[PDB]
Scaffold this active site. Structure first.
Site, mmCIF file in Angstrom:
data_model
loop_
_atom_site.group_PDB
_atom_site.id
_atom_site.type_symbol
_atom_site.label_atom_id
_atom_site.label_comp_id
_atom_site.label_asym_id
_atom_site.label_seq_id
_atom_site.Cartn_x
_atom_site.Cartn_y
_atom_site.Cartn_z
ATOM 1 C CB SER K 81 -0.978 0.057 1.183
ATOM 2 O OG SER K 81 -0.361 0.621 2.327
ATOM 3 C CG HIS K 106 -3.028 -2.441 3.023
ATOM 4 N ND1 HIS K 106 -2.620 -1.618 4.050
ATOM 5 C CD2 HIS K 106 -1.911 -3.058 2.569
ATOM 6 C CE1 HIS K 106 -1.313 -1.731 4.210
ATOM 7 N NE2 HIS K 106 -0.859 -2.598 3.323
#
Lengths: 172, 176, 176, 176, 172, 172, 176, 176, 176, 172, 172
Positions: K81, K106
């Site tokens: 991420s 994420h």
């Protein structure tokens, strides 16, 4: 190499912060190397330390007064009751300080009677050392020492510690 | 409670207090509390004070002395172990005629060992040290110039020497 | 309380004290406190003292000895485990005729192991070590020159050797 | 108190002592204290001794053995868990006819594992190890040369083997 | 390089602070290198240490007396009962000290009887070593040792430790 | 560079303090380098260590007796029952010691029976090694070992450990 | 005492013992002590044993099993939480007809996880692991070859599967 | 409980409270709780307050002062040890005529020593410091300009100087 | 127990609860438990609540508020020390006419200071902060827009300002 | 060598993160080396630090205004109330910042009265320093300082701190 | 020398693992050295880091878009991420990834309201940055971000992050 080496090549002794028994043997060793290399060129010292001890202070004070090269003390930042003595121990007329300097003068730092005796002795020794250079009397400095006196760059010029305040050299 | 915390409580009911550690800001409060409790329980008996202290401070022992003087009872101080610069002052602080000592006691006549307020700390220590040298001469009866000479030499004493010096009055070899 | 702190309290009511650790500035105070409590409770009985100590200091054991002598009771000292340079002095400190020893005891006749005040520390240690060598000869009855020779060699003993040496008087093999 | 410190106290009133840790300078003192308390409370009953010890020292277990022999009661030793070089000596130390063992017990016949005084430390360990090998032959009835051969091999046993070896006398499978 | 190397190039042994068993093998190794390189040029030693041990003190004392090069001891700061012996063990006439020096002389630093015996032995050895150089008697030094004697640069010149006090070489 | 390198350049093995299993592989590696470089020039060893182990002592003892270059042991400071063996294992006639040396000889340093057996074995091995060089008998050394014997430089010359005591080479 | 140490003591008076941690050398001793105390208090009642253990050792659980068998009472074992390789053996160790289980129990049929004496350590572990596989087949009634196959697969069970397997006899959904 | 925790409880039944530590956020709560308990037990007696404090904060001592004023009893404050910037305010807070002092007391007239909220922290400290300088002048009766000059100099006092200054009213040398 | 743990228990019998620490997940549970116990003991008396809290959380103080409202008694809240963002809400939560304050109290009207679930953590904090601003306006009677302006400025108050603001109803200077 | 040396070779002073009393003596030493080497070439400074002290901030502020070489401040990342003063103390017209910069302006960081006094003094000094360069009045900056003001690269251009925002020089 | 120096000699910036405030000043210093040495040769960056901060992420994102040399991002391992933004910020057509790459997307990582506000701001900034390069809309990326999306090398080519998947160059 580090910029400290390039400064020492120009005979610049940058005193570190919180000088103590271990940080004094390094500044006393640089005053003996630059004195044997070139004895007539002056040695400048940039002062920046928020206080320190006193047992090692008198070991550097007389060392600055023992070398033949003149000491040019330039105050950078502040001086919390320990670096002010070294700032005032420089050559008269070469003690400079930035306009945002904070020359602090306060109290320095059977085991209760002899401790107080040694504290009084080091206090009066520091006061005599300060009065020898500033041309004042020990009583006035003792009266200004009991309180946490905070001297500015403009308030320290007429006090006797520094002789001139450095101006800004900006071309624009 | 515990084992050592129960025997002391059981002995407190028999008007017996102990001092087996260096008198400091902690033990002094407990000693004064026990003395005041024993004085409030009864004001017509004696309080046995067994002294065994290898050291301590004077600022804390002065409070114990004032508490002993304030109690209307008759403090009977004993030299159980060894008194070192703080147990002798409390041993001689008891009433004349009740200051006993065990035959293997060692009384050490000595003064206690002891920022920006060190000046007032030395002035306060210099006003209570001379007061101790006055009470020591008042209790033992010796001249004042004797303790000022015997204090710096760390002159140790025995149960027989402390009897003729003026510290204690009897040597309990076989009693109750 | 605890498990080991309750059995000792229950045995204290039956006039039984224990010593299972090295005598120091801590255990000595508790021992003297227990002895004084048992002497103040009753002055016409005996106090069983089971000794099992692998070591200790002499300055603290001297106070225990003076406390045992001060108590008007009859101390019955036993050699439960092993006495090492500090349990023998308290084992022989009991009254003659009540110093027993278990058949697997090991009495170690030895002296205890032990700035700027080291001179007075050595002078004070040299005045109580010779006093211990006098009480040891007075208790066991042996000549004084015998313990000064048996102390430096770390000569260990058994329950049968300590009986003929002068330490104990009986060997309890099957009793109450 | 606590949870495990209250059940042991409640069982002590019923003349039941436990040993669930390695016997050392600590547990041995508590065991002797409990045995002496149970012997002073009553001298006409039995003291159940449940043994479960994965190890321990011999200098501390010898004191427990002498305390068990000194008590005028009848010690009934049981093999609850496993005996490892120190639980067997106390299991066979009980009176003949009261040494029981659980059907899943493991008796380990083995000797215990163990500056400038190492010589006397080895001489003292060599005088109590041979004494243990004599009491082990006296209790079990086996020849002396058998345990000196079964001790170095770390020969483990079961509840049925220890019955015919001479350690225990009964195997409680369903009793009270 | 560090200023310590530039000092050692001029045969300067800067004794550190709190000399012990580990800090003595480094000063005893420098006395054996400078002695083999140039045996007639003197070796100067700047003294700055607030005390130390004694088991390693006698290992450096005789080492300074074993080399053929003369030792010039210059006291910087203080000397707490351990560096004073090395300051007085230098060559007679070359023992210097700054005017703000504090030559301290106090007590140095079965396991109770033999410990006191070794302490008495090292104490009388130190007193004999001090009396051998200062030309005094062991009794006077023992009488002045029991108390925490604090000697100044002016009080140590007539005492026998130092021979001359260094003055300030400032040109202004 | 450090003075240790300048000493090793002159074939000087400065034994450190508290020799152990880790500090022995460094002194045993220097005895194998100087032996292959120049096999007839002697190797001197300055002894300074307040004791040590024994499992590594016998690894250096035979190593000093295995090289072809002669070993000249010079005692600096003290030797607490471990460095004395190496001081006495040097070449006869080249074992020197400063006049303030303290040659200490005391006790060196199922897991209880075998431990005592190994201790007795190493003790009698050390006594045999000491009696082989000092020319004495193992009984006398065992009688003098049980107590904490403290030998001085003058008391060790007639004992058999050292052969000559070094004098002061001061020119003034 | 404490909060959790008082509720357990109050439940002990009602013949109720707990097991909420991994059985080891500590919890096993307390469990056997509680069982023996409850058996000595009364020998005509039942002892409820609530089992909730995420693991444990076999050497310690064997002693608990022998103690449960030795007690002349009727142990009523319950499956409160989850049994993991050590709670099932104690759950099936109770008398037939008193082994209950909560409707959300998880019985894990599995064997326990577990210098120079590793050989005898493996031989002793190999003689008690086969004994456990015999008692497990004797209690549940299943063939011996079934548990040796269901033990290595870590086959988890439910309250309904353990009822038909042979572990428990009833599923208390709404009772007293 | 403990030894020092039992004597304080026994003295609490006799309406005697102690202060032997630096007053902070902890000791102040206990002091107010004890004062409120003694006021709820009886509202027609006196509460002895022995003061021995080497320091403390003002924000916590103000609550103790308000609690002392709220209690309808008559607080009798004593100077047992030494008052340092926080014990004097509570010593003079008692009713006029019950403020005693031991002959070896040391009253230190001094003010207490003491992110992004430092402005309001200084404003709150500046509104309670001037309030303390008003109550100190109201209690002692001295002019307001006297304490503002004697506070910054750290002027120490004795039992005789504090009597004529206005702190205490009597000097108990030999009383009950 | 202890010294501070016994005075609180003795005051609990007189229907007096304390709050001398920052309200958190711990102190809130004890406060609700004490309030529920005092409400179950008697439902016709008053419960004195002395408030001295330098801070705390709102999620824990909301439970204390709901517990105070649930109790059928009459809570009498007092401002003993200083209320900082959590003591004022409980001080104004008492019944109208029983909210007192000591003359040296400092009420600080302020809101409390306070992975991947920060969104729901901010949404839950934004739904209880507006609820607090409604109850504060309902209790004090001031307009809602006044507290939303006095909360962000950290405006400190005194005992006289909080009386006219709407926090308390009386100023106890000399009462019972 | 490290990329920091290759940057310093081009007279680039990369200010580290969390500047304090110890991290200021290194940035004040680089401003004195580059000023003596080449006095007319400008010195650029990449600003990246999430806050810091203030006692060392005024020691670098006047130092940047004391050297003769012009300072080109380029903001990289953020500046949490301490690096913003150095970003605004650069040469007018050479104060740049990336389009994703976060110029934060918030509150900087007897011992209770004098502490608040020193905090107020340093706060008003910082506000005067900010108003001297941004051309604003101290009141507006004090009103915008009490809250945690978060200025973006576009919101700081018209505020007076930076003069131009750097664009992307991507060829594709 | 270390292989990192031999890689940097070929203008290879190997991003370390767990990039933070301290590990970003080293990668931002290498992007300024290689840009001044050779401004038309591309710079490749091997991506390997299991996540990191965001306060330093935006300081490297614009820095990669500020240099004139083209960035060739090659994903090695994974990107949790944080490194995915740098992998997608490279030059279009030069964003490569090994066939066993795991591009993870994420959620990145009063002090409760302002914290959530800053988190929402950095989240929407990251989503806008991802949608600017991948050519998608912020809503779709926000819908795919709330869950722990795990993209493979084949699932990331048609997503817009990478443009080509590297094949095996084995000759046997």
């Amino acid at each position: 190499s580090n910029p400290y080496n390039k400064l020492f090549e120009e005979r610049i002794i940058f005193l570190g912060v919180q000088v103590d028994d271990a940080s004094a043997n390094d500044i006393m060793a640089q005053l003996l190397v630059l004195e044997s290399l070139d004895p007539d060129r002056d040695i400048t010292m940039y002062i920046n330390s928020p206080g320190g001890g006193f047992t090692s202070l008198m070991a550097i004070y007389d060392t600055m007064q023992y070398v033949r090269a003149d000491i040019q003390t330039v105050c950078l930042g502040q001086a919390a009751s320990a670096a002010a003595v070294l700032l005032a121990a420089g050559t008269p007329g070469k003690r400079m300080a930035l306009p945002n300097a904070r020359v602090l003068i306060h109290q320095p730092s059977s085991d209760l009677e002899i401790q107080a005796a040694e504290i009084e002795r080091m206090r009066t020794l520091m006061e005599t050392t300060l009065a020898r250079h500033t041309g004042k009397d020990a009583g006035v400095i003792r009266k200004d020492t009991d309180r946490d006196k905070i001297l500015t760059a403009e308030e320290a010029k007429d006090y006797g510690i520094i002789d001139t305040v450095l101006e800004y050299r900006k071309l624009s | 409670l515990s084992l050592t915390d129960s025997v002391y409580e059981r002995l407190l009911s028999e008007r017996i207090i102990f001092l087996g550690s260096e008198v400091n800001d902690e033990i002094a409060n407990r000693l004064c509390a026990q003395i005041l409790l024993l004085a409030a329980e009864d004001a017509s008996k004696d309080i046995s004070l067994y002294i065994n202290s290898p050291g301590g401070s004077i600022s804390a022992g002065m409070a114990i002395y004032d508490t002993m003087v304030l109690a209307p009872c008759d403090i009977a101080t004993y030299a159980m172990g060894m008194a070192a610069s703080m147990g002798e002052f409390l041993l001689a602080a008891g009433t004349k005629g009740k200051r006993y000592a065990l035959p293997h006691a060692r009384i050490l006549m000595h003064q206690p060992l002891g920022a920006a307020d060190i000046a007032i700390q030395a002035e306060q220590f210099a006003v209570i040290k001379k007061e101790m040298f006055r009470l020591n001469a008042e209790f033992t009866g010796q001249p004042i110039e004797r303790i000022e000479a015997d204090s710096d030499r760390d002159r140790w004493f025995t149960a027989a020497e402390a009897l003729e010096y003026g510290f204690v009055d009897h040597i309990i070899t076989r009693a109750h």
